[PDB]
Amino acid sequence: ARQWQPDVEWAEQYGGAVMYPTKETAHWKPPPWNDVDPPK
């Protein structure tokens, strides 16, 4: 009855490394938050 605003199911579409995940772009995890990688 109120206005629709996006939920977690809608908002997790924009959280991947890409927007349209294909077979090649499937192992791509999103980058780190401070963009700093472990030193390995």
Binding site: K29, P30, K40
Partner: protein
């Protein structure tokens, strides 16, 4: 034009395709940029010494300066690749693919 410019431009193109086709080893291609600087040096210097345009004779020296002034830059950027990873292989530099 003259016969030697054929081979100096040929050496530029050989070093160009050597730079522009990597063999998974970054130092082997940083040599190719230095070879392109060598070929540009010899080509410009043949042109300047040929025509006796003497005031541009200081030009290849200056050219050569910026040669190492970026080559050193590449080596300063070679050691940070080879401190993050044990090797300077260019296929380790693929984190920005996502």
């Amino acid at each position: 034009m003259s016969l030697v410019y054929m081979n100096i431009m040929m050496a530029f193109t050989v070093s160009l395709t050597g730079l522009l086709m990597y063999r998974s080893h970054l130092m082997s291609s940083l040599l190719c940029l230095e070879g392109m600087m060598l070929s540009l040096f010899i080509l410009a210097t043949l042109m300047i010494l040929n025509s006796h345009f003497t005031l541009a004779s200081m030009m290849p020296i200056i050219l050569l300066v910026f040669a190492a002034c970026e080559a050193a830059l590449g080596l300063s950027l070679l050691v940070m690749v080879s401190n993050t990873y044990g090797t300077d292989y260019v296929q380790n530099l693929n984190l920005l693919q996502c």
